[PDB]
Amino acid sequence: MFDPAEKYKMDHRRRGIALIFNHERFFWHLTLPERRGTCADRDNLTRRFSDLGFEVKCFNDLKAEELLLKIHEVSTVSHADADCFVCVFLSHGEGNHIYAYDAKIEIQTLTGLFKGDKCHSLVGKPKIFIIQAARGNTNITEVDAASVYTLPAGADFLMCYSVAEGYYSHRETVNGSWYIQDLCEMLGKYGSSLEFTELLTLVNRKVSQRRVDFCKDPSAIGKKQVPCFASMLTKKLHFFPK
């Protein structure tokens, strides 16, 4: 019968793959600013997700063709023995696009690779995309306007965004992005016990509570950050120790 507290089965041999695409610099013709602090984000995420049992694979500054080949390769291997799939993008973005080193990629192209008809072995399993991407312009805080649409996807996808329309994303050149810092803090403390959307709700609270009334750079005053997640999940999701 119907179970109001049903959970995703997370008892497979493996947790699954976590991909991280990390973009620090861009081809000069794109005239996009460097993203100092993103290496801190990459390291932070790698630790958190590997502590949760993921096989973490990171890729720095791939060209779009390279990035598409890689994510296509991952979407076509068997995930039969895995609980779930995680994909993280650390870059700049605009509308439904994220930047690779040399060109834009559509987010729907990336998520479409893992829909049921294209990736049988992930059907009914969580497919989690985490996007730190906004508009490209000693610990300095850089502030970027929200630009990437908070796009949905298929059943059992969870799309997690650093910032909503009308707000601003922040990145510290030494400590990393506000959103990734808070996400990783919460993963470290609560990742292995809390329901994951409950955890993302804590991240919403942490990030939106960061004060912007007295920034070192007076131009940044008032530029609040509010993250958000778009859930198409159909069950409760936990990452209990395997």
Ligand X SMILES: Oc1ccccc1CNc1cc(NCc2ccccc2O)ncn1
Residues that bind a second copy (CB under 8 A): 2, 4, 6, 108, 149-155, 161, 164-167, 186, 189-190, 194-195, 197-198, 200-202, 204-206, 208-209, 224, 226-236
Say if residues 31 and 100 touch (Cβ distance below 8 Å): no
For position 98 contacting ligand X by CB under 6 A, the verdict is: no
For the chain, what's the residue count? 242
How many angstroms separate the CA atoms of 10 and 241, rounded? 10
CA torsion, points 168, 185, 14, 120, in degrees to nearest 10? -20
Contacts of 114 (CB under 8 A, 6+ apart): 75, 85, 122, 127, 154, 157
Considering beta carbons, is residue 140 or 155 the nearer one to a second copy? 155
Q: How far is the CB of 168 from ligand X (least distance, A)?
A: 11
The residues, ordered by sequence, that sit 6+ positions from 155 with a Cβ below 8 Å of its Cβ are 116, 232, 234
Determine the interface stretch with ligand X among 37-45, 58-66, 149-157, 232-240 (rule: CB under 6 A). 149-157
Q: Which is nearer to ligand X, 143 or 194 (CB)?
A: 143
In the three-class reduction of DSSP (H, G, I as helix; E, B as strand; rest coil), residue 42 is classed as helix
- 152 scored as a contact of ligand X (CB under 6 A): yes
Among positions 32, 45, 56, 146, the unique one binding ligand X when judged by CB under 6 A: 146
- Assess 149 for contact with ligand X (CB under 6 A): yes
Stretch that binds ligand X, among 7-15, 20-28, 37-45, 141-149 (CB under 6 A): 141-149
Task: Work out the angle at residue 36's Cα, subtended by the Cα atoms of residues 31 and 41, and round it to the nearest 5 degrees.
Answer: 125
Does 151 bind ligand X (CB under 6 A)? Our answer is yes
Which residue ranges make up the site for ligand X (CB under 6 A)? 146-147, 149-152, 165
